[PDB]
């Protein structure tokens with residue numbers, strides 16, 4: 001696929017601290033068309049359920065639509081294309097051969113733009129998946145990392161090395177979103193990156209991409225994005241079909257954050 | 265309510281050409297909290313069905329939520345507060361006494377951020393409603409007018425006197441949205457304005473507000489917004505529950521555009 005050249009292929013050295021959670025992230029199609037990003041999340045039972053977090057605006061919100069989604073694992077460029085180069089802006093060499101079809105919708109809610117699916121097919125050990133941890137505490141972090149499929153193309157990584165902020169979407173009054181500021185010449189996110197995770201420094205999901213002003217040409221405060229918060233989605237719309245808590249902590253352990261789980 | 269001072273109270277002379285479609289627009293609450301804008305739309309049978317167009321991201325997509333929504337008609341400042349003045353930025357004197365409760369969802373679709381509700385209660389003649397026309401043709405216009413409740417506060421009007429453009433949301437590749445550019449010191453839209461109509465110069469709904477960079481301090485290309493298009497929503501997700509056509513032209517007249525219908 002094709003995305004902005006300033007983005008950073010996950011196989012680049014910039015991915016060296018994220019070789020586990022890289023394997024959580026997937027691209028998917030909707031009604032056959034490459035559409036959005038999501039990622040696999042662990043739950044407090046550490047049971048490998050195929051919980052797959054994405055964005056509500058991607059429209060994976062009915063049983064009918066979820067039934068025919070196709071999830072593509074391990075779609076990334078085989079080599080590190082220099083960020084900012086014509087190569088990085090070119091069609092990559094990723095494979096779309098490792099896939100699975102079908103899901104059900106466990107919860108969805110507009111306010112924090114989240115959808116939690118559960119994929120129908122158990123993880124194929126051969127795909128070498130990872131279920132990422134999460135952190136639902138009400139706080140900002142000193143930096144964060146995005147792993148995403150911009151334009152639903154090969155997987156990329158984008159780092160933030162400044163504090164997050166809490167606000168409503170697009171800077172409005174509110175607390176539903178984490179505002180993440182990209183590096184002046186670093187990776188960003190693009191349409192199709194929606195639903196991709198943002199990870200704390202401890203590699204725990206804090207939210208999933210809603211949208212924002214960033215692009216490779218964006219400067220200043222425009223080089224940033226908003227993530228619907230796990231903190232907010234945890235309680236969501238106050239019902240099991242509109243929140244994360246029933247799914248990610250079904251046994252009521254009281255966990256405020258958990259670590260990931262490998263397929264190994 | 266309180267909204268940005270650059271906005272223009274509908275009773276101002278700027279509303280002199282829109283005294284009909286002003287009466288289409290309402291503010292509404294969601295689980296009791298003032299939340300978003302929507303508006304009444306005519307259909308090809310001219311029958312006063314309470315079709316009420318709003319934005320999908322406002323989250324009025326389930327029977328439970330739609331059943332408890334409250335719609336507030338004729339909420340506007342009684343006098344024209346000078347745009348840009350401290351008065352315009354102050355709490356207004358609108359009334360929230362003319363209301364009705366409850367709706368059902370007729371159609372919704374994420375890609376053009378639309379929801380078509382049908383309100384449960386037939387129009388009270390005393391509220392003096394108007395059902396606006398619509399135009400589903402695939403084209404730009406030379407200007408456009410927004411009527412909306414920014415911050416879900418008193419009703420405002422914003423005029424665009426330059427051409428619209430067609431794009432995806434936030435300027436992405438696509439054709440799902442109408443991009444409307446506000447006047448350098450004119451009215452804009454704000455969170456809470458979502459779901460409000462944009463009208464052609466002929467006063468026909470062309471779409472409903474999704475979002476965008478505008479605010480009273482925005483300049484240039486940022487002083488603009490994106491509306492999910494009626495053109496796009498007409499066919500929507502390809503089923504009656506995901507598109508406008510079955511509802512706004514149930515009669516199968518083949519109309520490409522219709523005019524409005526007054527309570528009289």
Ligand SMILES: *C[C@@](*)(O)[C@H](CCCCN)NS(=O)(=O)c1ccc(C)cc1
Nearest residue numbers: 057189190191192193194210211214
């Ligand atoms: C849906 C997502 O892929 C995008 C991500 C944009 C990231 C830009 N830096 N979100 S969005 O805001 O463009 C969007 C929101 C709603 C709809 C219906 C489409 C696109």
Ligand SMILES: *C[C@@](*)(O)[C@H](CCCCN)NS(=O)(=O)c1ccc(C)cc1
Nearest residue numbers: 321453454455456457458474475478
């Ligand atoms: C929901 C709407 O009230 C706003 C309108 C913003 C207008 C700015 N000029 N849309 S939004 O983009 O701020 C938005 C989109 C999705 C969600 C969940 C919240 C807000």
Ligand SMILES: [Cl-]
Nearest residue numbers: 057211321475
């Ligand atoms: Cl949105």
